[PDB]
Design a protein around this ligand. Structure first.
Ligand SMILES: *[C@@H]1O[C@H](CO)[C@@H](O[C@@H]2O[C@H](CO)[C@@H](O)[C@H](O)[C@H]2NC(C)=O)[C@H](O)[C@H]1NC(C)=O
Ligand SMILES: *[C@@H]1O[C@H](CO)[C@@H](O)[C@H](O)[C@H]1NC(C)=O
Lengths: 97, 38
C-alpha cells in the first residue's frame, strides 16, 4: 500500500523491503504538467520489448520510452492509496483509475 | 496452489509422461526470440 503526502495517515508507505540495491534495468525520472486534469497512458509489449506512452494535455498520446525485458509480462495491479485526504468528511475528492 | 493417487501428478516428468492434459507443465515453443521459461 501507499500513502499520500498531504494530510498523511497513521500508516507508512511500505510495499518493498530491500536491504541492498537490487539489480535494475531502467531508472529514469520524468516531469508532467501538474495543472492537467486527466492523464492517459498506453502500456503494451511486443517481441519481448515493453513500450510506454503518456500524455498530459489532450487526448492523443506521445511516445515516452521503451525497455527490453526478454520475458512475457502476465499480471498488473494497482495498490490502494490510504491517507486522510480522500475521505468523505473532508473535501469531496475521489480517486479514479 | 498445491499439486493435485488422488493428489498425484504427471509421474514421470513431462518429458516422458502420458497424460498431458493433467500435467501442469505445458510444452511450449519459443516465438520471435525470448528465453526458455523452464
Ligand atoms: C526521482 O524522483 C524521486 C522523488 O523526487 C527521487 O527520490 C528522492 O531521492 C532523494 C535522494 O536519494 C531522497 O533524498 C528523497 O527522499 C527521494 N524522494 C522520494 C519521494 O523518495 C529520485 O532520486 C529521483 N531519481 C533520479 C534519478 O533523480
Ligand atoms: C497544463 O494544464 C493546464 C490546464 O489543463 C493548461 O492551462 C496549461 O497550459 C498546461 N501547461 C502548463 C505548462 O501549465
Amino acid at each position: 500500500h501507499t500513502v499520500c503526502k498531504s494530510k498523511g495517515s497513521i500508516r507508512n508507505e511500505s510495499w518493498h523491503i530491500d536491504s541492498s540495491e537490487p539489480l535494475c534495468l531502467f531508472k529514469k525520472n520524468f516531469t508532467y504538467n501538474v495543472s492537467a486534469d486527466w492523464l492517459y497512458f498506453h502500456f503494451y509489449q511486443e517481441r519481448g520489448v515493453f513500450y510506454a506512452y503518456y500524455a498530459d494535455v489532450g487526448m492523443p498520446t506521445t511516445f515516452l520510452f521503451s525497455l527490453y525485458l526478454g520475458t512475457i509480462l502476465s499480471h498488473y495491479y494497482v495498490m490502494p492509496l490510504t491517507c486522510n485526504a480522500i475521505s468523505s468528511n473532508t473535501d469531496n475528492e475521489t480517486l479514479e483509475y | 496452489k498445491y499439486r493435485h493417487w488422488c493428489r498425484c501428478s504427471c509421474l514421470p516428468d513431462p518429458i516422458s509422461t502420458y497424460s498431458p492434459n493433467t500435467c501442469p507443465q505445458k510444452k511450449v515453443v519459443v516465438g520471435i526470440g525470448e528465453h526458455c521459461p523452464g
